[PDB]
Amino acid sequence: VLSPADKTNVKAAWGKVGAHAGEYGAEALERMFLSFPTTKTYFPHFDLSHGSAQVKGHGKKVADALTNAVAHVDDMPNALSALSDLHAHKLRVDPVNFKLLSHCLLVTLAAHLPAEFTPAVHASLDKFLASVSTVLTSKYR
Amino acid sequence: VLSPADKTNVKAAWGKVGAHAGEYGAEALERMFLSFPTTKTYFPHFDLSHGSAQVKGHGKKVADALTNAVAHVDDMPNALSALSDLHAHKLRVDPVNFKLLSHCLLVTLAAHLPAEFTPAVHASLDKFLASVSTVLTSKYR
Amino acid sequence: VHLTPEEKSAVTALWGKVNVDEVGGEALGRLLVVYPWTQRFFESFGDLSTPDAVMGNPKVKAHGKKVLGAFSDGLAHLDNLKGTFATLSELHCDKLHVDPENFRLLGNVLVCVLAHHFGKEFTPPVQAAYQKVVAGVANALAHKYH
Amino acid sequence: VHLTPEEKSAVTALWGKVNVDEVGGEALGRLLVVYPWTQRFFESFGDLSTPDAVMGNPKVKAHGKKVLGAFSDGLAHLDNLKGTFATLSELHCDKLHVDPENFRLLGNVLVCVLAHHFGKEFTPPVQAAYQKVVAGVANALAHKYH
Numbered sequence: 064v065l066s067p068a069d070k071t072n073v074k075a076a077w078g079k080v081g082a083h084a085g086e087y088g089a090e091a092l093e094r095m096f097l098s099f100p101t102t103k104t105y106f107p108h109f110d111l112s113h114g115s116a117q118v119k120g121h122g123k124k125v126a127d128a129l130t131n132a133v134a135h136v137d138d139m140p141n142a143l144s145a146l147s148d149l150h151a152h153k154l155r156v157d158p159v160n161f162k163l164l165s166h167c168l169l170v171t172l173a174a175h176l177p178a179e180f181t182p183a184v185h186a187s188l189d190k191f192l193a194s195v196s197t198v199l200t201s202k203y204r
Numbered sequence: 205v206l207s208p209a210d211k212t213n214v215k216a217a218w219g220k221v222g223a224h225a226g227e228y229g230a231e232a233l234e235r236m237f238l239s240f241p242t243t244k245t246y247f248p249h250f251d252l253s254h255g256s257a258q259v260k261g262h263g264k265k266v267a268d269a270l271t272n273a274v275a276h277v278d279d280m281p282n283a284l285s286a287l288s289d290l291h292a293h294k295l296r297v298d299p300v301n302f303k304l305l306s307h308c309l310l311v312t313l314a315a316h317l318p319a320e321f322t323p324a325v326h327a328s329l330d331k332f333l334a335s336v337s338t339v340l341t342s343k344y345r
Numbered sequence: 346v347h348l349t350p351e352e353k354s355a356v357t358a359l360w361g362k363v364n365v366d367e368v369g370g371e372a373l374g375r376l377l378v379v380y381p382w383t384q385r386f387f388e389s390f391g392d393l394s395t396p397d398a399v400m401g402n403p404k405v406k407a408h409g410k411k412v413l414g415a416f417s418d419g420l421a422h423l424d425n426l427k428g429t430f431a432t433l434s435e436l437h438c439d440k441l442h443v444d445p446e447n448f449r450l451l452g453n454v455l456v457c458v459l460a461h462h463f464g465k466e467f468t469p470p471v472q473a474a475y476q477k478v479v480a481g482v483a484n485a486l487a488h489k490y491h
Numbered sequence: 492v493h494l495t496p497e498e499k500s501a502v503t504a505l506w507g508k509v510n511v512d513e514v515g516g517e518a519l520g521r522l523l524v525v526y527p528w529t530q531r532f533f534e535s536f537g538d539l540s541t542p543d544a545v546m547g548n549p550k551v552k553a554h555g556k557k558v559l560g561a562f563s564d565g566l567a568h569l570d571n572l573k574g575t576f577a578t579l580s581e582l583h584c585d586k587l588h589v590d591p592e593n594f595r596l597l598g599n600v601l602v603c604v605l606a607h608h609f610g611k612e613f614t615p616p617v618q619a620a621y622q623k624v625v626a627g628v629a630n631a632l633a634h635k636y637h
């Protein structure tokens with residue numbers, strides 16, 4: 064469960080990300096594809112190399128979903144309901160991959176937010192991304 | 205989430221297990237220590253010799269907790285509240301190990317319940333053990 | 346993975362008693378029932394709407410047999426699983442686009458199916474040997490991913 | 492993995508700029524903050540009750556130094572990580588009773604720390620090389636468990 068401090072930390076950190084949310088989403092995806100090549104199996108229809116228009120566009124979608132999750136941090140199962148439907152019935156990504164993307168999002172945030180990415184905020188963001196991941200895999204079976 | 209159909213399958217299967225639960229718990233532990241030796245790192249204080257009474261005793265405790273979870277399958281977070289506290293604050297077993305024990309419990313049930321271990325019951329039992337694991341790691345951080 | 350000479354014997358001995366048709370069909374079938382998101386790879390197999398439909402599906406059964414046949418061939422290469430599955434590894438990566446995590450799931454289900462069939466004969470030490478094998482096969486099938 | 496020569500150079504180049512003592516303390520500290528169940532191994536280290544209590548804990552910092560020191564020495568042997576870490580693997584199993592999953596957790600926290608310190612210099616390809624390294628080191632430290 065996300066603590067009061069967790070939610071304060073997530074809102075502060077994502078707030079600082081601000082207009083960069085989409086850029087950072089795309090960067091996290093690129094980091095994932097390069098660091099964890101097995102994740103590329105879910106994107107055979109994508110150009111995955113640097114400067115990909117498809118990756119940039121998908122990064123924006125992922126980031127916007129996270130922004131919505133932050134806005135509804137006390138009701139994520141319902142706020143993300145349509146998206147969790149899509150993941151369960153269509154995308155059907157194995158749950159391990161959510162940890163890989165989450166890690167790459169953390170790396171991206173660490174690389175861009177020197178002052179903000181404290182150990183406590185790091186901890187809170189990891190919990191947050193784990194909670195989002197849990198919601199998105201909650202309807203798999 | 206455990207469906208009403210899942211709960212029916214779990215209650216039926218565990219009912220068939222009956223007083224064999226303690227025995228099957230010990231067998232599942234034995235299977236886990238042999239198949240997944242890293243799990244032994246949580247029991248250096250145990251006698252792990254063959255037929256260990258200490259292991260059998262622990263198997264009984266694990267089984268009894270599962271039996272209680274089946275009996276309160278509609279409200280497992282409350283039924284397992286004290287146990288989840290102990291896991292989070294003292295035992296602190298890494299979450300990856302719960303899947304290893306769950307698998308070994310399934311293998312044990314499959315080996316003892318040739319008629320009851322249908323594909324549907326297999327699926328329900330897996331969901332049930334995953335749900336118990338989720339409750340037991342829910343207070344970790 | 347490194348099996349002991351005693352474990353290699355136990356693996357080979359048990360496998361000599363395995364009905365590959367039944368176990369293969371059961372393993373692939375249960376993969377699709379227990380972890381239904383894995384059905385994403387088998388839309389061309391037709392009806393996968395119910396557990397009975399999945400287990401009774403002729404293409405599921407045929408594929409399961411084929412998969413377990415390749416698995417069986419690997420049991421004759423236990424000291425070089427990477428080498429013998431190198432071709433299939435590349436295939437699953439580049440042509441089939443199968444997340445290797447699925448190899449682990451199938452291994453899990455296969456061990457359950459073996460336990461279901463053999464009962465008490467599937468002893469904890471025999472299980473331990475087979476866990477080494479399914480881990481080895483999954484790792485070998487994942488090894489050439491890029 | 493299987494590092495490319497371009498990746499080995501990238502790893503070596505970045506590591507030359509790393510204060511190993513400092514990064515070690517930071518990485519172990521963050522492990523205990525982000526995954527607080529890992530504190531189970533360090534009851535004798537004293538106060539671990541808050542993020543600041545953990546990060547500034549002198550015994551945590553000291554231990555982090557020796558852990559990343561061993562890690563650092565291993566970077567000179569990327570083609571034989573299993574051999575390099577064999578005695579430490581045996582020690583962590585037989586004497587310390589440390590679940591090897593912890594090595595994986597530490598590796599990913601270390602990657603986060605490197606990104607935090609180096610910023611844009613920690614490029615996606617540089618990260619990818621370091622992910623190969625921390626996976627190799629974790630696998631090597633796990634290899635002699637029994």
Ligand code: HEM
Nearest residue numbers: 383386387389411412413415416433441443447448451482
């Ligand atoms: C022990 C593990 C496995 C082995 C030995 C294995 C082996 C094989 C073999 C021999 C083929 C046929 C190759 C050919 O036609 O040239 C095949 C095809 C295929 N495999 Fe695997 N496989 C394994 C696991 C999996 C898993 C876990 C999945 C997905 C969840 C999967 C998905 C597929 C698919 C989709 C095909 C193509 C089927 C079609 O023709 O429609 N495999 N596999």
Ligand code: HEM
Nearest residue numbers: 529532533557558559561562579587589593594597628632
């Ligand atoms: C890169 C990964 C790691 C390396 C290279 C490493 C290396 C070392 C070394 C060189 C020692 C001293 C050995 C001795 O006392 O003879 C040590 C001790 C120890 N390590 Fe590890 N370590 C790693 C990861 C971890 C992790 C992730 C944990 C637990 C979360 C851990 C737990 C311990 C403990 C409890 C000790 C003994 C500390 C004491 O003396 O009280 N290690 N490690």
Ligand code: HNI
Nearest residue numbers: 102105106124125128129146149154156160161164195196
């Ligand atoms: C490794 C695979 C993978 C992971 C870990 C992952 C994790 C996540 C996370 C985790 C925090 C979030 C918030 C998220 C959000 C989204 N994903 Ni993900 N997705 C993944 C693979 C996909 C794929 C594949 C698509 C379809 C993209 C396309 O364009 O076809 C997708 C599509 C989406 C969409 C677009 C929905 C739509 O079109 O209606 C959103 C939003 N996602 N994905």
Ligand code: HNI
Nearest residue numbers: 243246247265266269270287290295297301302305336337
């Ligand atoms: C691999 C490690 C591990 C796993 C996966 C695990 C998973 C589980 C599951 C999963 C379904 C259940 C129901 C369960 C139940 C229990 N465990 Ni577990 N435990 C584990 C390692 C332990 C250890 C260690 C103890 C302390 C034992 C002792 O007596 O020192 C323990 C203690 C217990 C107790 C005793 C509580 C008490 O003394 O008050 C129960 C009950 N458990 N454990």
